[PDB]
């Protein structure tokens, strides 16, 4: 197997486990704490805030340690965070059936589960930056990164779609433990693939404030897109389509499942324009395409009838092609421009800015819960996309 293929292989194997575990966690939490949707929501809060605080620290860490040390810590931190996740899950489940739903021990085991969620989240982040933003631009020719990145995206999408199917089949919470074992095993092949490629190549040879770097505006333009509720899997939109739009749930599900389809189209359209028009302009056209498509979607949203609801949803799906396109573009731009010595720091600034956006989106769905308040979330989402377009146009003047 070639170098570029080995990198994609380890990614594919570990992702299918990631997407599987990330799928059953809310459902498992629902089994242990039924009727309390606040539990699953509070779990993901601790993870995101936990990963947040630990992001700049890990960034400086990646830049001051051997690559084989980042990979080792990056992967095995996930391995034991999931292993502990299974244990605490089993203890939580076992204790509840035993009748201890109102004890301090239940809370301690939940914080433990949450904290293990933080570590897995962190290790996954350290690994993403290591594999995709350090090892890849060090092993793969610059003219072949666009091809590399497309297959990364398809891995994400394939496993995203493959997760509810396989894990849904496998899943007292015994199916959850078959998911975790899958997830655990899935970590191993990549670590050794990553270990061995380092040991036999020049990757061993690497010599070991952030907002004031020009590439932050590239980072900011991508993070702004995370401040959006105009997404097929967005819960606020799914709820809105159900009650205010009075759409069939069968059609809401179809709209949801077509997100990965249009995302896959980007892996065809975006590399094509890069080969024809170049990296920057391709990112511009795709990012602009998202703006125009969403701009039409919002125009139809108000007003406003139940006849424009498909123009609303249809243009959202079209914007997914543009969104996923610019995503690979901004990603490759960080692969190409970020200096080797600051790959851990600057890419962590990226994760920090996207995590912040997600946290704001959490706080927006909590402070604006009404379905009559959804109207403002549409207007703000569009604004964030339009601002992103301006910020990226300005930056691309380089
Ligand atoms: Fe994995």
UniProtKB/Swiss-Prot annotation:
It holds the Pfam family FPN1. Residues 64-66, 140-141, 277-278, 338-342 are cytoplasmic. Signal peptide: none annotated. The keyword Metal-binding applies. Residues 33-36, 98-103, 244-248, 302-307, 368-370 are extracellular. It is found in: Cell membrane. Its cofactor is Ca(2+). It is a multi-pass membrane protein. The cofactor facilitates a conformational change critical to the transport cycle. The binding of Ca2+ from extracellular fluid activates the transporter by triggering a conformational change that enables the transition from the open outward to open inward states. The chain crosses the membrane at residues 3-32, 37-63, 67-97, 104-139, 142-170, 174-200, 215-243, 249-276, 279-301, 308-337, 343-367, 371-396. Ca(2+) binds at residues 18, 78, 183, 190. Changing residue 233 to D: Complete loss of iron binding. Completely abolishes the transport ability. Belongs to the ferroportin (FP) (TC 2.A.100) family. Iron transpoter that exports Fe(2+) from the cell. Also binds to Co(2+) and Ni(2+). May act as a multivalent divalent metal transporter. The transporter is composed of 12 transmembrane (TM) helices organized into N-terminal (TM1-6) and C-terminal (TM7-12) domains. The substrate-binding site is formed at the interface of the two domains and is alternately accessible from either side of the membrane. The transport cycle is viewed as a series of ligand-induced conformational changes that include open outward and open inward states. This is Ferreportin. It comes from Bdellovibrio bacteriovorus (strain ATCC 15356 / DSM 50701 / NCIMB 9529 / HD100). The lineage of its organism: Bacteria, Pseudomonadati, Bdellovibrionota, Bdellovibrionia, Bdellovibrionales.
């Amino acid at each position: 197997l070639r170098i570029e293929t080995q990198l994609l292989l380890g990614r594919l194997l570990t992702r299918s486990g990631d997407q599987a575990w990330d799928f059953v966690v809310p459902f498992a939490l629902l089994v242990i704490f039924p009727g309390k949707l606040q539990v699953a929501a509070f779990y993901y809060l601790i993870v995101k805030i936990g990963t947040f605080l630990l992001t700049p620290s890990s960034g400086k860490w990646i830049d001051t340690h051997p690559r084989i040390q980042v990979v080792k810590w990056g992967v095995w931190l996930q391995f034991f965070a999931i292993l502990a996740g299974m244990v605490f899950f089993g203890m939580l489940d076992g204790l509840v059936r035993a009748g201890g739903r109102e004890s301090w021990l239940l809370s301690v085991l939940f914080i433990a589960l949450a904290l293990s969620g933080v570590m897995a989240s962190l290790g996954s982040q350290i690994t993403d930056i290591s594999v995709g933003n350090d090892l890849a631009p060090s092993l793969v020719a610059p003219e072949k990164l666009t091809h590399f990145n497309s297959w990364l995206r398809r891995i994400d999408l394939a496993t995203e779609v493959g997760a509810p199917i396989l894990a849904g089949a496998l899943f007292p919470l015994a199916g959850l433990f078959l998911i975790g074992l899958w997830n655990l095993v899935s970590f191993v092949p990549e670590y050794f693939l990553l270990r061995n490629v380092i040991q036999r190549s020049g990757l061993k040879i690497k010599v070991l404030g952030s907002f004031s770097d020009p590439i932050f505006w590239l980072i900011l333009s991508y993070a702004l897109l995370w401040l959006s509720v105009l997404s097929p899997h967005g819960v606020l939109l799914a709820a809105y389509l159900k009650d205010e739009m009075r759409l069939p749930e069968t059609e809401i599900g179809l709209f949801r499942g077509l997100g990965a389809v249009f995302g896959l189209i980007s892996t065809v359209s975006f590399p094509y324009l890069v080969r024809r028009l170049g990296l920057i302009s391709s990112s511009r056209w795709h990012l602009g395409f998202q703006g125009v498509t969403l701009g039409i979607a919002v125009t139809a949203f108000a007003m406003g009838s139940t006849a424009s609801v498909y123009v609303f949803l249809g243009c959202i799906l079209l914007s997914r092609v543009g969104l996923y396109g610019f995503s690979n573009g901004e990603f490759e731009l960080r692969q190409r421009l970020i200096p080797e010595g600051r790959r851990g720091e600057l890419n962590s600034l990226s994760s920090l800015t996207t995590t912040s956006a997600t946290l704001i989106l959490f706080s927006a769905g909590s402070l604006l819960p009404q379905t009559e308040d959804f109207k403002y979330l549409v207007y703000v989402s569009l604004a964030a996309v339009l601002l992103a377009n301006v910020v990226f146009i300005k930056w691309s003047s380089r």
